[model samples]
Target: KTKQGVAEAAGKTKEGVLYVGSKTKEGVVHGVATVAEKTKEQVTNVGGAVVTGVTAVAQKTVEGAGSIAAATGFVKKDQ
Candidate 1:
């Protein structure tokens, strides 16, 4: 989700997975990639908070505690 003015951005390279982004300044020039121009360092590690995506989620219940443990087992089956 990075395209408003586009200084530089291209991410999502899997391997050990480390990506963090948020920097308005402090050596700002956050991304750039180009290779096979003659294949020097092969262009892989350009930095300064440049990461495009990665996400996964499976949270069943914590706040509601699975609906209070199914309403306390349906009130203990009405005793």
Candidate 2:
């Protein structure tokens, strides 16, 4: 179960908002960022219910979503 949790968190971090880089002679340069606030909200709201279920699966789902938000770096490390 703990392993599952760790994996879920890792997946969330990897699935965070992605930026596209522009090609340049020097190197690939990234532009202004576009964030997915709505998607992050959905994940956050769902994650809040991690402890309100009768089954482990339900609890895990909530916890996983919360972990995903953290992993994704939606807000900030210290926020």
Candidate 3:
């Protein structure tokens, strides 16, 4: 799902409603949204996930490691 700040940047006019991506605006829910802190054992989400607010290379490096794990069978990919 899109954040109000990012959706604003992407030209979304409504901040009250969630921006679940390029699907129809007919409220099909396009997808679910995650709204909580992530834990080591429960980081994968059923709906698409977003990891914004990144502010450092090291953090990104760690996330990249996770991506690598997902690709290399170290972790299961989220549907």
Candidate 4:
């Protein structure tokens, strides 16, 4: 029934979210240097999606990752 398909999709979604989150954390750390030199354009493109996207995965994930992103001047602190 629909339940079976939903469960399968959920499983894939769970894995996909975790996978993206892991890569996002690494990108925030590694890309911090390059992202800093660029203007708001780059920040908005990366930070807008990456920051908010990370938060969507988990609020606490953003708390830690965002702290670094914010501290390094990549993302907004208030975000």
- Please, what are the lDDT tens digits per residue for candidate 2 over residues 1-79? 3342121212234666965444323222335445445553223453233322122111123324434312321333374
Alpha-carbon lDDT of model 3: 0.38
What candidate 2 gets wrong by more than 4 Å, as runs, is 1-24, 40-79
> RMSD in angstroms, candidate 4?
15.3
Q: What lDDT score is found at residue 19 in candidate 1?
A: 70
> If the candidates were sorted by their TM-score against the true structure, best first, what order would they fall in?
1, 2, 3, 4
Task: Go through the candidates in order and give each one's C-alpha lDDT.
Answer: 0.40, 0.33, 0.38, 0.32
Best by TM-score: 1
Query: Residue by residue across 1-79, what tens digits does model 1's lDDT show?
Result: 6554345545776688877565344223435554345544433543433333332223345346334221211222253
Task: Give the Å shift of residue 29 in candidate 1.
Answer: 21
Per lDDT, what order, best first?
1, 3, 2, 4
How many backbone clashes are present in model 1?
A: 0
Better of 2 and 3 by TM-score: 2
Count of backbone collisions within predicted model 3: 0
Between which residue pairs do clashes occur in model 4?
A: none
Report the lDDT tens digits of candidate 4 across residue range 1-79: 3332122222245333443221123233222222244435434464443442222111224335434323222544683
Model 3 regions more than 4 Å off? 1-46, 59-79
Worst lDDT window (10 residues) for model 2?
51-60
Best-fitting candidate, measured by lDDT?
A: 1
